[PDB]
Amino acid sequence: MSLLAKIVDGKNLSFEEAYELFNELKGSDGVLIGAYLAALQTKGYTGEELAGLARAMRDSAVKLDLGKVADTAGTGGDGSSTINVSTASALILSAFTRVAKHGNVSITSKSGSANVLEALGLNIRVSPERAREMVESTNFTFIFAPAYHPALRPIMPVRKALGIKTVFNVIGPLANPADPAYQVVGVNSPELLEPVAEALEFLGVERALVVHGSGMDEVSPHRETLVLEVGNGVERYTLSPEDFGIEPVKPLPCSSPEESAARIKAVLGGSGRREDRDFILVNASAALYASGVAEDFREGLEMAREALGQGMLEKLEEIACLSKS
Amino acid sequence: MSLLAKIVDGKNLSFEEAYELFNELKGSDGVLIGAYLAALQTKGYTGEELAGLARAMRDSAVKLDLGKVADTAGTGGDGSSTINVSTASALILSAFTRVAKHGNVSITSKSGSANVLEALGLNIRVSPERAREMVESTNFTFIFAPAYHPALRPIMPVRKALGIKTVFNVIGPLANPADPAYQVVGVNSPELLEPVAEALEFLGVERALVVHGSGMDEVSPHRETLVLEVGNGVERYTLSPEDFGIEPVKPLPCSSPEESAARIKAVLGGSGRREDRDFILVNASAALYASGVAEDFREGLEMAREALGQGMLEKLEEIACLSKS
16 A cells, blocks of 8 residues: 555655565455556556566565576567467577576466467476476476466466556566576567666676567567667667578468467477578577577577477477476 | 556546446456556546546436535545535525535545534435425535445445545545536645546536635635636636635634534634634635625625524524434
């Protein structure tokens, strides 16, 4: 109510106040949660607010011990139904470095990455100890957010009932309890680039890219991508598809997680639609760059492309098998 | 859902959408009520939104068949500051014209109009038929908001849990179901002047004064009073005690509805403290002017003051007698 009055008055919360707010929401009646989420969304976000809420959400999560990991994500998925490039990007990145992909419920309350990974044969809820074995054996695991954030249990039905976007759509990608050192975070509108970048700074990420490509929460293979790079301060620049060494190409629509899975798998084995391949590769390139395995985006695409083939399909089947053990 | 998304996007609702919003609120779960009230407060409400909400509230209320009636009110500061001039003004105005005073829709009503009128011996809970009969034979009745606004009953426990100001701390004086032709509405902040005046415009009031005097939702007998007059469009002017024909005097605080009623009753009978008498009279003059009883504020004060004395205390007795029968 005090924090609610401050928000309703248009005042931005401090990092500490936002950390407190998560713990208040955690134990609040639905009426108060609804009020906080609608008011907060009407006001808008600062980086300090996103980071405080996200840090409190990590601290309340099921604990993970996965070492130094990378993640790639979007606050949506969002917009059109295109293939799930953050999932494909995370799988390609595991050829190079440890990945713990956080999943990351959509506005429908379902995780698009969780549906795609299930279609690729994963059991998507794994224990913390299964997750550690997955990373140690394959460099990859999937952390399904509803399973790792029991504190959100009273919040989920409120988010469902309100139907509007809320702060939880933005902090989802910031709330990975593995504490990723490296992150790609796509955002669904350009006004979120600066607060999300500042929040990653507040959270101590070693290197991150916050991207907004052709109006979507991903790197575009077709038009310009706005980028904020975090790690030496915050740097702003714009990428074009030519910076990755591809010709511009428009992504093609997708109707179901099953189709999304099949098209991603075909790319991973070195085949697939050229439009899917180049869309996946520019996003994989950004993940390799953010995790320091590539020095620039042209090299990141070149290295990601060389990893596709039979070995990548073999990695995928052992990830699937290990997740069901 | 749709109206909530419009509000949290910062878009102002049309009159007809604000009408729908009220009818959506009254049948909504607390979670959605809480989100709607907090988001609209964060955005800020407009005159058009206040009017649509208020018209839907009037249309949902218990039906009244009073005549052409007048009302005087405050939005509201504190339940302990000054004596309740709007109740005194309403009683005095009934010597000249039909008055249906609308009670306060906020949970406080501490030294509110309802408390003061009971401390003056009225039964404030009258059925629609006693109300008509009271008006026909004394020119005065009082509309108890909790009993005339059933649709508010789900809303009230949400307002209590939120503990913030909402649009309902403001909409009350615009929501008189007897559709007053004449109104004085004090507002507690200068920023309420324009939207409340606009709202009265949209709602078709024949003549109204929206007033803010010396920082309070009332006419000041001490300092300047900002006035918006609604009728021929909207006219703006500033009054001073000189415009009522009195020397400036500072109104003084009171502690309880009982002391408020005793100090008002002494004025009504022709005595009382000079500070209370001239405070009541400048507000009574505003209501005589808004009602077309008096042509200007000097005359309104003159006419109000000559109605005080034994006959006024006898009118109060008859009002109280009839309200109990």
